[PDB]
C-alpha cells in the first residue's frame, strides 16, 4: 500500500507547499499496520485513502485452480507454454491430476475457453483384420 | 517361474505380467493403459 | 510508545499441516506464484510444510492447498482370459 501511496499522492508541477503541513508515510511488516505523521487537516486525507484502499475481495483471482476431466495434464503443461508472453506460469500437479494458472488475473478467460475446447470425451475404434491362403 | 537364457546370462520371467495405469475422469469412467502376457 | 505494540498473532511465518498428499511433490510443484520471493520448505519427518513468504497474501496459498488436499478414490481392476486348443 505505502509502496503505492507515494505514487497517487506525491507531488505536482509546483509543490503544494514547503516541507511542513504535509505528511510522510512508512510502515513495518511486523504488525501489518502503517505509520503517518502530520497535521490535523493533512492526515485525514491519508486515512481517507486507506479507508478506501482497505476493501474486501469479492473472490481472489490472482490464482485459480482448475480440474481437467478427460485429458492428462502432463502433455498440457508443455503444449501450453506461450499465449501472451510478465509471463504465464502454468503448473500441473499430477497427483490429483489438476493444473494451476498463476498468470494474468484478467484474461484467464482466454484460458477457460481453450481448456474447455481441450477437454473432451474421445471415441475409440475396433480394428480386425483377416487373412487366408491355400497351398 | 523365472529362467535364465544365455545372452554370461541374465534373468528371464515367464508367467502372467499384468500391469496397468488407472485414470478416473468423469463421475464414472476410467482409463486403462494395460499390458500383459501369458507365457 | 506507539511503535512498541503487541502482536495479535505473528504472521511472518505460519506452519500448516497437510492431510492426504505428501509434501515432497508439493514443494517442487509449487515454486512460483508471485515472484522478494516465496520460500517454501517441507519437513518430511512430521509430513508438514512451511510458508515463510509474504505475510499478506498467504490467503492465496491457503485456498490453493485447501483445493490440493483431498481424499482419493481407488479402483479395482480384474482381467480374464481363456482359450482352447
TrEMBL record, chain A:
Residues 1-58, 63-124 form the NolW-like domain. It comes from the Bacteria. It is found in: Cell outer membrane. Belongs to the bacterial secretin family. GSP D subfamily. This is General secretion pathway protein D. It comes from Klebsiella pneumoniae. The gene is pulD. The chain holds residues 204 to 354 of 657 of the full protein.
Automatic annotation (TrEMBL), chain C:
It is found in: Cell outer membrane. Residues 13-74 form the NolW-like domain. Belongs to the bacterial secretin family. GSP D subfamily. This is General secretion pathway protein D. It comes from Klebsiella pneumoniae. The gene is pulD.
Amino acid at each position: 500500500v505505502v509502496k503505492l501511496v507515494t505514487e497517487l499522492n506525491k507531488d505536482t508541477s509546483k509543490s503544494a507547499l514547503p516541507g511542513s503541513m504535509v505528511a510522510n508515510v512508512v510502515a513495518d511488516e511486523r504488525t501489518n499496520a502503517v505509520l503517518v505523521s502530520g497535521e490535523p487537516n493533512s492526515r485525514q486525507r491519508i486515512i481517507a485513502m486507506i479507508k478506501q484502499l482497505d476493501r474486501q475481495q469479492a473472490v481472489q483471482g490472482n490464482t485459480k485452480v482448475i480440474y481437467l476431466k478427460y485429458a492428462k495434464a502432463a502433455d498440457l503443461v508443455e503444449v501450453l507454454t506461450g499465449i501472451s508472453s510478465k509471463n504465464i506460469i502454468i503448473k500441473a500437479h499430477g497427483q490429483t491430476n489438476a493444473l494451476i494458472v498463476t498468470a494474468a488475473p484478467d484474461v484467464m478467460n482466454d484460458l477457460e475457453r481453450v481448456i474447455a475446447q481441450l477437454d473432451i470425451r474421445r471415441p475409440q475404434v475396433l480394428v480386425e483384420a483377416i487373412i487366408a491362403e491355400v497351398q | 517361474q523365472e529362467v535364465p537364457v544365455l545372452t554370461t546370462v541374465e534373468r528371464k520371467t515367464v508367467g502372467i505380467k499384468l500391469k496397468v495405469k488407472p485414470q478416473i475422469n468423469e463421475g464414472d469412467a476410467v482409463l486403462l493403459e494395460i499390458e500383459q502376457e501369458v507365457s
